[PDB]
Ligand binder design. Structure first.
Ligand SMILES: [Ca+2]
Ligand SMILES: [Ca+2]
Ligand SMILES: [Ca+2]
Ligand SMILES: [Ca+2]
Lengths: 26, 142
């Protein structure tokens, strides 16, 4: 029941991780 | 300034990754989630992702490290819900099926039964067509 809203923030955490790498690569 | 609700929000997200409950997110658990979410991360960029936030160089993300990077960027959440729907609706048909919802929870390693999945849709499906549309999906998240 508390699974689905967590998926929303899980997605954001991946965008942030990928942004942190791209920030470094540039 | 970090509310008790944001922290629990971040804790629930962490526990989705940490499938084994050892308190750490590994490349395996990170890659497993990203694939369930429709992405295909290269094993090297998985390593580079852990590397950005691993402060003590053990090759894992723990909760405070996870908390640290989520707390830095709390600038505003609707497109977040929208994109999330786009992830679940694989055939782009505008409805999340039980199978479209099964194939994500199965890929996540949620270890849920096909009836457990079908009860998740049942709670969310308001108009009774057997599928979850975006507006039903919104109420489920919010
Ligand atoms: Ca682990
Ligand atoms: Ca660590
Ligand atoms: Ca469908
Ligand atoms: Ca519907």
């Amino acid at each position: 029941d508390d699974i689905m809203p967590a998926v929303k923030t899980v997605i954001r955490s991946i965008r942030i991780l990928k942004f942190l790498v791209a920030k470094r690569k540039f | 300034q970090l509310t008790e609700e944001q922290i629990a929000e971040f804790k629930e997200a962490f526990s989705l990754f940490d499938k084994d409950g050892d308190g750490t997110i590994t490349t395996k658990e990170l890659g497993t989630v990203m694939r369930s979410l429709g992405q295909n991360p290269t094993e090297a960029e998985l390593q580079d992702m852990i590397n950005e936030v691993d402060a003590d160089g053990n090759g894992t993300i723990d909760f405070p490290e996870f908390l640290t990077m989520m707390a830095r960027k709390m600038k505003d959440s609707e497109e977040e819900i929208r994109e999330a729907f786009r992830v679940f609706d694989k055939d782009g048909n505008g409805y999340i099926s039980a199978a479209e919802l099964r194939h994500v929870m199965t890929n996540l390693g949620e270890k849920l039964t096909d009836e457990e999945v079908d009860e998740m849709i049942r709670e969310a499906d308001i108009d009774g067509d057997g599928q979850v549309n975006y507006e039903e999906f919104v109420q489920m998240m919010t």
